[PDB]
Structure formats: structure tokens, C-alpha cells
């Protein structure tokens, strides 16, 4: 029977069946609860919406992502998310379906452990497995070498892989991702007079970011340009009319990824961490890594990000090295695609963790090579 591929991530849950071509159901991984009291008896309002239901009821709810930076903080909301996924989005009894789960590298081992435990106890799957998002993203790109730069909504990691071997000592996790960009945009949008403070209108700001923002090939030139002309201003319709306009912000916001100082962080920019991860690997495999910079995750979907990325990492690397950047047009779902591909193997059908084996060895089994 088929396996399920549920890629949790932050911001967006992506689920589907192994062997399909795209995740069947995709919805925001949020949980909302009403924050007023309600007066119409007989309306039978439930006590907590979830997913697109909440995304539609935003106006009267308080939304709380149960995953902060790759880690799961509120376990009850996470279980609600999973249950809603299985029983509504896919409408499938999870008792007869091995499920594939993903997580970023360098996470609290308790996270993965409790994940396994809840999966086997509450939902009672027959088997399961936890995979590293970046490996799956490489699978989905038909590569077998090259460093991958996943950048979802919560975390941003580089994983250099060569011939299917991973160099763990060169993995570079960094906690700057789409949520941080959304917040920085909320902040700099004040200096025009626009004030979004509610957890609801954070979603509005996220939409504004996904629509109007883009990466500038040269920051100073774009700044001077937006100063001189006004050919960069674009408007936007809020959910109640009152069109707004943003100029400089459009490219100031995603610029953070290259200058994390904008939000007070100290770590180096995306290009810098990539180049450092390269330099940590052995010298014989650096040319291929230069040639195969895969990119996935929704945050790497900015108009112009690949060109700026290539420009920078070219400025850093030697001149006799060919820099290339593999940025497919569907890269947002590359992790789920790679997960489907992997779970569809048969040489993989003996890497699962069987319910019996779990009962025999307890949640500590995950860290064992039943990985």
C-alpha cells in the first residue's frame, strides 16, 4: 500500500501520497481560537479552527504557528494539525499507511523523539521515518552532489552532499527565514504610516511580501534609484480597500538575507554562509559544489534572488570556478517532491521503523540507524 508524505515545516503543511507528482493538500500550519465571546446561541461555534478554516476566520481569531524555528513548541496544536491533515485534507485512515516526516538539521533530539512517539501512539501508523529536508530537496532535483540551500519559513540550512555522502561537519543552520522577513517588513512599513500589529494582519503583510518584494542585484544603485525616480512604487489593495503604496521597502525587506544586521542578528549573509560551507568541505569536491548550488523553500522564491546570489558567491570564489545556481520554477515543493520520490523506492521499503520495532525499543530507536 502507498505511503504518506507529510512535510510539516513552518508556515505551510504539505501532504500527499508517495508516488504522486505534487502534494495533494497544502494549507497554512496555524491554529486559531476565538478571542471574543460570541452571542448567537445555536451557532455552535467550535473552540479552535485550523488550517484554511482559520485563515478564513482570521478576523476574530488569534493565530499561533505551533512550530517556531523548525522545532515544535506547542505539541497539542501540532497534534491537532496532524489529525486535521489526515482526517480532512487527505481523508485517509492512518492505521495502514507508513508516513514520511521531515525536519531541519541540528534540531533538539527531543523534538524528533516526541514526533515518533505521538505518531506511533495517537495515530497508530504501521511505520514511519524522519528525513532531512535538504536530502529530499536534492533527490527532487535529480542531482547526487551539490550543496542545497533550503530556506523555508522558519529556518535556513545548507547541506553539502557529494556522491550521496553528506558532510555533517559542514552543515550550516541559520535561524533567519520567511517569518523574520515578514516581521522586518511589518516594522519598516510603519515609516510610511501603515501599522499592522495583529496576528491576523501579519498574514496581510505576508501576502504583500509574497507579491511585491524582490531582491535587488545591487543594493546601493537601487536605493539611489528609488530615491531619484518613482518607477519602483507599486500599490496594493488591503482587504477593506484603502490601497497602499510601497517603494524602497520592496527590495529593502528581502535584502536582510544578505545583511542580517538589519534585524540585529550578527551572523553572515546567505552567500557568506554558503561560501563558508563550501570552504569547510574537502578541496577536491569544491568545484562540483560551486557548480551545483541547489535552492529550495518558499523564501528562495524572490524575483531576482538567484542572480544576486550568483553575483555575490562569484565575488567570493576564485575566478576560474564556474558558479551555477539550480533554481527550478517549482522549488517551493522540492522537499515534498523528493520525499515522494524516496518513499516510492523499494530499496527504501526496509528503512522504515516498524510499530513492532518501536514497541520493542522505545522512542530512542529514531536516533539509531533506523534514522
Amino acid at each position: 500500500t502507498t505511503a504518506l508524505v507529510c512535510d510539516n515545516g513552518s508556515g505551510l503543511v504539505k501532504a500527499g501520497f508517495a508516488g504522486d507528482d505534487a502534494p495533494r493538500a497544502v494549507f497554512p500550519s496555524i491554529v486559531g481560537r476565538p478571542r471574543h465571546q460570541g452571542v448567537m446561541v445555536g451557532m455552535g461555534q467550535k473552540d479552535s479552527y485550523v488550517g484554511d478554516e482559520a485563515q478564513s476566520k482570521r478576523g476574530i481569531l488569534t493565530l499561533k504557528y505551533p512550530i517556531e524555528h523548525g522545532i515544535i513548541t506547542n505539541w497539542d496544536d501540532m497534534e491537532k494539525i496532524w489529525h486535521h491533515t489526515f482526517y480532512n485534507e487527505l481523508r485517509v485512515a492512518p492505521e495502514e499507511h507508513p508516513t514520511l516526516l521531515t525536519e531541519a538539521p541540528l534540531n533538539p533530539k527531543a523534538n524528533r523523539e516526541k514526533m515518533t512517539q505521538i505518531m506511533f501512539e495517537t495515530f497508530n501508523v504501521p511505520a514511519m521515518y524522519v528525513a532531512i529536508q535538504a536530502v529530499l530537496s536534492l533527490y527532487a532535483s535529480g542531482r547526487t552532489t551539490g550543496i542545497v540551500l533550503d530556506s523555508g519559513d522558519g529556518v535556513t540550512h545548507n547541506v553539502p552532499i557529494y556522491e550521496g555522502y553528506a558532510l555533517p561537519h559542514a552543515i550550516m543552520r541559520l535561524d533567519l527565514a520567511g517569518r523574520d522577513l515578514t516581521d522586518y517588513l511589518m516594522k519598516i512599513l510603519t515609516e510610511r504610516g501603515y501599522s499592522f500589529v495583529t496576528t491576523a494582519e501579519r498574514e496581510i503583510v505576508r501576502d504583500i511580501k509574497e507579491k511585491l518584494c524582490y531582491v535587488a542585484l545591487d543594493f546601493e544603485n537601487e536605493m539611489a534609484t528609488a530615491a531619484s525616480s518613482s518607477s519602483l512604487e507599486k500599490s496594493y489593495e488591503l482587504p477593506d480597500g484603502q490601497v497602499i503604496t510601497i517603494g524602497n521597502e520592496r527590495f529593502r525587506c528581502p535584502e536582510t538575507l544578505f545583511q542580517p544586521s538589519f534585524i540585529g542578528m550578527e551572523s553572515a549573509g546567505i552567500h557568506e554562509t554558503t561560501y563558508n560551507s563550501i570552504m569547510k568541505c574537502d578541496i577536491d569536491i569544491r568545484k562540483d559544489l560551486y557548480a551545483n548550488n541547489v535552492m529550495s523553500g518558499g523564501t528562495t522564491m524572490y524575483p531576482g534572488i538567484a542572480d544576486r546570489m550568483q553575483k555575490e558567491i562569484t565575488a567570493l570564489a576564485p575566478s576560474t570556478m564556474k558558479i551555477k545556481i539550480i533554481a527550478p520554477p517549482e522549488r517551493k515543493y522540492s522537499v515534498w517532491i523528493g520525499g515522494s520520490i524516496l518513499a516510492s523506492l523499494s530499496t527504501f521499503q526496509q528503512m522504515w521503523i516498524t510499530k513492532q520495532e518501536y514497541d520493542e525499543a522505545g522512542p530512542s530507536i529514531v536516533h539509531r540507524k533506523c534514522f
Binding site: 542585484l217 524575483p303 531576482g304 542572480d307
Partner: protein, 55 residues
């Protein structure tokens, strides 16, 4: 002179591609707006019609 003219070709290619693609974003948004104004005309000429009807 090979490498200098090659660098010229690179920068020209790149900036021209960025210009083409920003005009491509503009064409996306203007096709959207064109269909928008299309259904706008539809619905507002239609309310004009029903206005004439009840008039």
C-alpha cells in the same frame, strides 16, 4: 581583451535579462489588469443595463 569583452558581455547579458524579466512581471500584471477591466466593463455595463431596465 578576450576576458574584458567577455566581462562586458556578461554584465550586458545580465542587466538585459533583468530588464526583460521585470518587463515580464509588468506584462503579467498588465494582462491581469486587462482581464480585470474586462470583467469590470462587463459588470458595470450590465448594471447600466438593469438600470435602464428599471428606468
Amino acid at each position: 581583451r578576450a576576458q574584458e569583452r567577455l566581462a562586458t558581455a556578461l554584465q550586458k547579458l545580465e542587466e538585459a535579462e533583468k530588464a526583460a524579466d521585470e518587463s515580464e512581471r509588468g506584462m503579467k500584471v498588465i494582462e491581469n489588469r486587462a482581464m480585470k477591466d474586462e470583467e469590470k466593463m462587463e459588470l458595470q455595463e450590465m448594471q447600466l443595463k438593469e438600470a435602464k431596465h428599471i428606468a
